[PDB]
């Protein structure tokens, strides 16, 4: 069975039936029937949809040796900040546990060993703590600074 | 079956129990189970009241490293009442009195100064020798690796030399004899070598089964492997837990007569008495050390023991104990 | 622009020291630092053959003051000498006794 | 009988069982050689050992598991001028024993003048002893701070809890009779450990006895309410009942409202309280008899390992001097705080009551392990050996503070001692019905 997926911009993608069961939300929709036309995904970008399509297709193809998948998912993560954030959001939305786990592991690895100075430069975030509260929290975690 | 015919039943039982207890305790990783070791060890406490002519008390030499030592001296003849705490540091009487700085064994990782076996050994040494004995409590590997023991021995020797109540009328100096058993032999040798080029003059050394090793296996390790309560695996385990990580058995602390070690010729070294047990696995290394001392130009007397095993100086029910004690008494009272 | 749950998913796969360091960067990260699940899983990382169910231990620890204090008061000093050492049942008993005694101290009549 | 050489060496082996011991040793050797390092790990960590001096029972337990007087003195270098201090102090004690008072007063003044210029723990103990001698001449928060700044109470509490917990396995109804409730800082640990057991927490009954309130307060009621609140927060059943009594000699086995022993076990606890009773003639025998009538399953006793019940004043004075000088020496590395000062005040009150007071008023009459052993064994009580788990927990306790420096724990004859290096200070032991 062939399934047509429609993106927000208007692009159409063709997917298979066995890979559809990988997304348990789509499986839950399927067992309740009431699905004849292409399922629309409003708040999803097209390129992220293509990327997750490639990921799931490769995973099901490989599943049907561990070093091979380790190398493949290592090579997959050669994307910048924006693609990583979009992929994390998509994995949250369609609820694929493996992709979300991999993305969160990658982000945890790249934040590992950082300092309250390095993290703010990494993510370009605004420090909203006053000197008093900042000194307080630094003193609370002072054991980590030695 | 071979061990039960060389040694009496009591010594066999004691050494077998020690071997089993240490075997249930050794760790392949390299870590040391300290708590059960302390629980299983049998210790005693000092008794200022004279018991069979010997009393003892503890002195805390150093507080930064918790360096402690125990002192045994003979009972006072002029004091019928037991000596008081103020009388513990009474100046010694006699024209020449020797003091023995003693180091215990345990492969640097077992036993303590207040252990029962070494307390009894020091009491017998005081009784037969008629001398003062200082037993040092050095730090134990692997939690405290090289060179902690040598520093502890050096500090104890400096403390003993600087005392004023352990002195001699004849020359107004202290007559110090260094003695050690098993690991204590290595510690005594290293401390004597250090003190030779420092100012403190040492009278003699008494080594009881000294511990020395190298990479090349000798001809005694293969035949006696695991036949007289000692195996080879424990030897490498103990030497690995002592030496710094990333070092072999050709370190100078393991083999004094190594290419990296300093030559003993041209340097001051006191006379020594080495006692070697024939039926032990480290016989060849002990004999090599004795011959190296002989060839270096320093005086050394060899006492080769034909049919004695390790731990022959822990019970007086054998015949070699008397010979060793008599030889030591002749060596110190010369 | 990260939301609350995704930050939890990120910090799930981080170690104790890095989590403590990241507890200070921002307010949202600070809020996601004190969830008891992360510190529970960190604490139950060097425990083997405990002898009791995880639910009972979690409930008792939560009643006695949480897992963060349990880790930062007794477990870290215990692991400071030998970081690579598994904690058996006896270390758990000692730490839980200390925590219960502290909770008895701080509580008012 | 026992082998003499082994006995002095420190092992208890009968002469008629030497061959059996050797056979067991060889069997254990082959059994351990058969198994891999897994059996060695199992005996290193999973198992526990009782009474290592008894080789026969220790070897039997290993085989079953694999195949299912004396006085101690320590000198301190910080005695540059302490020799004159001890000279003057012992001279004053002897003069007191010689019915001479003017010389005693002059020597007290001399001790004060000399201690004016001294700097150390010697100064503190000398000042306290001089005050005690002055009090003798004239007649011729405490415990919380001490608990917080010293490890004696913590070690005693944890060893007692371990012994009681090991004695409360496989039982459904337990009851605890505490002869010194104090602040109840020991029971939270016992109840937390009993809550996380394997089988379900049983019903817990607590009956406490404490000294009369000097200010007519309800300290026992407050402690009971706090313990009940903690038990409710931990989900364990709890019944509490507090008692007020001047001494333990007025107790009775029928006045405690004891349930039958066949349906509920009884455990008696005592910490630093059995030596306060030796001052009254016949009290200790009556207390031991009522304990026997209770028929408990365990009796935990923690005491101070020193002889202070000698008839001669001078001997007691000397050994108390040396014990307390060692104690004050052992408290120099602790940083300065109000806790330290207030605990020195506690120890000063200790010394003052031990030295100046006399007669039944003096309650501070300690004894060593031996005499306590003969006293307990005269009423049909047998020892109960503790394991290595208590030893290890005590080691961790002493390692929490000061990086585990100075204080050491040792085992002998089924009892544990916590001491400064090699000088025993506190002795904990357990007994049962014979
Ligand atoms: C593993 C070891 C180490 C032993 C020999 C043994 O085979 C058994 C136990 C040790 C030991 C115990 C006490 C004595 O000091 C020693 C010399 C001995 O005879 O036996 C000790 C001796 C040693 O420390 O070298």
Write out key terms for the chains shown.
heterotetramer, B: 334 residues, alpha/beta, Rossmann fold, eight-stranded mixed beta sheet, 9 helices, 32% helix, C: 109 residues, mainly alpha, 2 domains, 67% helix, binds gibberellin A3, plant protein, RGA, GID1, GID2
- Strand percentage of chain A, roughly? 5-15%
Q: Spell the H/E element sequence of chain C.
A: HHHHHHH
Number of domains of chain C: 2
The CATH topology of chain A corresponds to Potassium Channel Kv1.1, Chain A
SSE-based structural type of chain A: mainly alpha
What is the tally of beta strands of chain A? 3
CATH architecture of chain A: 2-Layer Sandwich
Q: What is the global morphology of chain A?
A: elongated
Please explain how this structure is put together:
The complex is a heterotetramer of chains A (146), B (334), C (109) and D (434). Chain A contains 7 helices and 3 strands; from the N terminus they run ββαβαααααα. With 146 residues, chain A is mostly helical. Chain A is elongated and about 60 Å long. Chain A has a single domain, classed as Potassium Channel Kv1.1, Chain A (2-Layer Sandwich), CATH 3.30.710.10. The termini of chain A are far apart. A 3-stranded mixed β-sheet of chain A has the order 2-1-3, with no helix packed on it. Chain A has helices at residues 24-31, 46-63, 66-76, 81-94, 97-111, 118-123, 131-140; strands spanning 3-6, 12-15, 39-40. In chain B, helix 5 links the parallel strand 5 (175-181) and strand 6 (204-208). In chain B, 32% of the residues lie in helices and 16% in strands. An 8-stranded mixed β-sheet of chain B has the order 1-2-4-3-5-6-7-8, with helices on both faces. Chain C is globular and about 45 Å long. Chain C is an all-alpha fold. Chain C has helices spanning 4-12, 16-22, 27-33, 36-43, 54-64, 67-79, 89-106. Chain D has 3 domains: 4-66, Orthogonal Bundle (Arc Repressor Mutant, subunit A); 82-140 and 308-361, no CATH class; 151-303 and 372-384, Rossmann fold (3-Layer(aba) Sandwich). Helix content of chain D is 49%, strand content 15%. Chain D contains 16 helices and 10 strands. In chain D, strands 2, 3, 4, 5, 6, 7, 8, 9 and 10 form a 9-stranded mixed β-sheet that branches. In chain D, helix 5 packs parallel to helix 7 (121-138), helix 7 (121-138) runs parallel beside helix 14 (338-355) and helix 8 (142-149) crosses helix 14. Chain D is globular, with a radius of gyration of 24 Å. Classes of the chains: A mainly alpha (146), B alpha/beta (334), C mainly alpha (109), D alpha/beta (434). At the B-D interface, helix 1, helix 2, strand 1 and helix 3 of B face helix 1, helix 2, helix 3, strand 1 and helix 5 of D. The site of gibberellin A3 (GA3) has 14 residues of chain B, from helix 1. Residues 15, 18-19, 22, 105-107, 110, 182, 229-230, 234, 310-311 of chain B line the site of gibberellin A3. Chain A: This is SKP1-like protein 1A. Chain A: Keywords: Auxin signaling pathway, Chromosome partition, Cytoplasm, Cytoskeleton, Developmental protein, Ethylene signaling pathway, Host-virus interaction, Nucleus, Ubl conjugation pathway. Chain A: Pfam families: Skp1, Skp1_POZ.
């Amino acid at each position: 069975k062939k399934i047509v997926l429609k993106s927000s911009d208007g692009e159409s993608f063709e997917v298979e039936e066995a890979v559809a069961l990988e997304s348990q939300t789509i499986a839950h929709m399927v067992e309740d029937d009431c699905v004849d036309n292409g399922v629309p995904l409003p708040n999803v970008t097209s390129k992220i949809l293509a990327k997750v399509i490639e990921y799931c297709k490769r995973h099901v193809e490989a599943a049907a040796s561990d070093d091979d998948l380790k190398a493949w998912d290592a090579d997959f993560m050669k994307i910048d900040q924006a693609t990583l954030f979009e992929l994390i959001l998509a994995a949250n939305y369609l609820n694929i546990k493996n992709l979300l786990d991999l993305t969160c592991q990658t982000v945890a690895d790249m934040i590992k060993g950082k300092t309250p100075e390095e993290i703010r430069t990494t993510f370009n975030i605004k420090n909203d703590f006053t000197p008093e509260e900042e000194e307080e929290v630094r003193r609370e975690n002072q054991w980590a600074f030695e | 079956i071979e061990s039960r015919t060389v040694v009496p039943l009591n010594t066999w039982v004691l050494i077998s129990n020690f071997k089993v207890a240490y075997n249930i305790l050794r760790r392949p990783d390299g870590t040391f189970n300290r708590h059960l070791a302390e629980y299983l060890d049998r210790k005693v406490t000092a008794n200022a009241n004279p018991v069979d002519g010997v009393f003892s008390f503890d002195v805390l030499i150093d507080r930064r490293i918790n360096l402690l030592s125990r002192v045994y001296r003979p009972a006072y003849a002029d004091q019928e009442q037991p000596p008081s705490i103020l009388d513990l540091e009474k100046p010694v009487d006699g024209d020449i009195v020797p003091v023995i700085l003693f180091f215990h064994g345990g492969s640097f990782a077992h036993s303590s100064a207040n252990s029962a076996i070494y307390d009894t050994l020091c009491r017998r040494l005081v009784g037969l020798c008629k001398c003062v004995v200082v037993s040092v409590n050095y730090r134990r590997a692997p939690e405290n690796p090289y060179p902690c023991a040598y520093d502890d021995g050096w500090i104890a020797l400096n403390w003993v030399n600087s005392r004023s109540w352990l002195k001699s009328k004849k020359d107004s100096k202290v007559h110090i004899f260094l003695a050690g058993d098993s690991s204590g032999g290595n510690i005594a040798h290293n401390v004597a070598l250090r003190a030779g080029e420092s100012g403190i003059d040492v009278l003699g050394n008494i080594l009881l089964n000294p511990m020395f090793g190298g990479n090349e296996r000798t001809e005694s390790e293969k035949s006696l492997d695991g036949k007289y309560f000692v195996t080879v695996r424990d030897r490498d385990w103990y030497w690995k837990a002592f030496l710094p990580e990333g070092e072999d058995r050709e370190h100078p602390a393991c083999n004094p007569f190594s290419p990296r070690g300093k030559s003993l010729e041209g340097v001051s070294f006191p006379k020594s008495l080495v006692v070697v047990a024939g039926l032990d696995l480290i016989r060849d290394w002990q004999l090599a050390y004795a011959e190296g001392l002989k060839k270096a130009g320093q005086e050394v007397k060899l006492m080769h023991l034909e049919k004695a095993t390790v731990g022959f100086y822990l019970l007086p029910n054998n015949n070699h104990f008397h010979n060793v004690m008599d030889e030591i008494s002749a060596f110190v009272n010369a | 622009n990260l939301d609350e749950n995704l930050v939890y998913e990120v910090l799930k796969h981080v170690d104790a020291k890095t989590l403590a360091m990241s507890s200070c960067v921002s307010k949202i990260w600070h809020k996601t630092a004190q969830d008891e699940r992360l510190w529970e899983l960190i604490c139950t990382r060097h425990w083997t053959n405990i002898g009791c169910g995880q639910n009972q231990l979690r409930s008792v620890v939560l009643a006695l003051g949480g897992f963060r204090r349990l880790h930062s008061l007794y477990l870290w000093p215990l692991s400071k000498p030998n970081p690579r050492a598994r904690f058996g049942k006896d270390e758990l008993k000692l730490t839980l006794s200390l925590l219960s005694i502290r909770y008895y101290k701080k509580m008012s009549f | 009988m026992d082998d003499e050489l082994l006995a002095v060496l420190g092992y208890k082996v009968r002469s008629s069982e030497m061959a059996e011991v050797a056979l067991k040793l060889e069997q254990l050797e082959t059994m351990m050689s058969n198994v891999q390092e897994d059996g060695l790990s199992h005996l290193a960590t999973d198992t526990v050992h009782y009474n290592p001096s008894e080789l026969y029972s220790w070897l039997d337990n290993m085989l079953s598991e694999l195949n299912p007087s004396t006085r101690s003195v320590i000198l301190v270098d910080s005695q540059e001028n302490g020799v004159r201090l001890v000279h003057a102090l012992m001279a004053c004690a002897e003069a007191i024993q010689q019915n001479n008072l003017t010389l005693a007063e002059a020597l007290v003044k001399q001790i004060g003048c000399l201690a004016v210029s001294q700097a150390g723990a010697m100064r503190k103990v000398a000042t306290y002893f001089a005050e005690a001698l002055a009090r003798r001449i004239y007649r011729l928060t405490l415990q919380m701070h001490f608990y917080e700044t010293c490890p004696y109470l913590k070690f005693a509490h944890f060893t007692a809890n371990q012994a009681i917990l090991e004695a409360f396995e496989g039982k459904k109804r337990v009851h605890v009779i505490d002869f010194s409730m104090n602040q109840g800082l020991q029971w939270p640990a016992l109840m937390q450990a009993l809550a996380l057991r394997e089988g379900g927490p049983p019903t817990f009954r607590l009956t406490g006895i404490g000294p009369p309130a000097p200010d007519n307060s309800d300290h026992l009621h407050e402690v009971g309410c706090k313990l009940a609140q903690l038990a409710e927060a931990i989900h364990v059943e709890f019944e509490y009942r507090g008692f007020v009594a001047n001494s333990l000699a007025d107790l009775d086995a029928s006045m405690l409202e004891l349930r039958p022993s066949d349906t509920e076990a009884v455990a008696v606890n005592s910490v630093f309280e059995l030596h306060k009773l030796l001052g009254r003639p016949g009290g200790i025998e009556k207390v031991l008899g009522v304990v026997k009538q209770i028929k408990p399953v365990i009796f935990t006793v923690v005491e101070q390992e020193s002889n202070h019940n000698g008839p001669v004043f001078l001997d007691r004075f000397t050994e108390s001097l040396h014990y307390y000088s060692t104690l004050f020496d052992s408290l120099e590395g602790v940083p300065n705080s109000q806790d330290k000062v207030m605990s020195e005040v506690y120890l000063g009150k200790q010394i003052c009551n031990l030295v100046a007071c006399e007669g039944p008023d003096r309650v501070e009459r300690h004894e060593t392990l031996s005499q306590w052993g003969n006293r307990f064994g005269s009423s049909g009580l047998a020892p109960a050996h503790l394991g290595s788990n208590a030893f290890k927990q005590a080691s961790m306790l002493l390692s929490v503070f000061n990086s585990g420096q100075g204080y050491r724990v040792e085992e002998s004859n089924g009892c544990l001692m916590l001491g400064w290096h090699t000088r025993p200070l506190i002795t904990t032991s357990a007994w049962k019905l014979s």
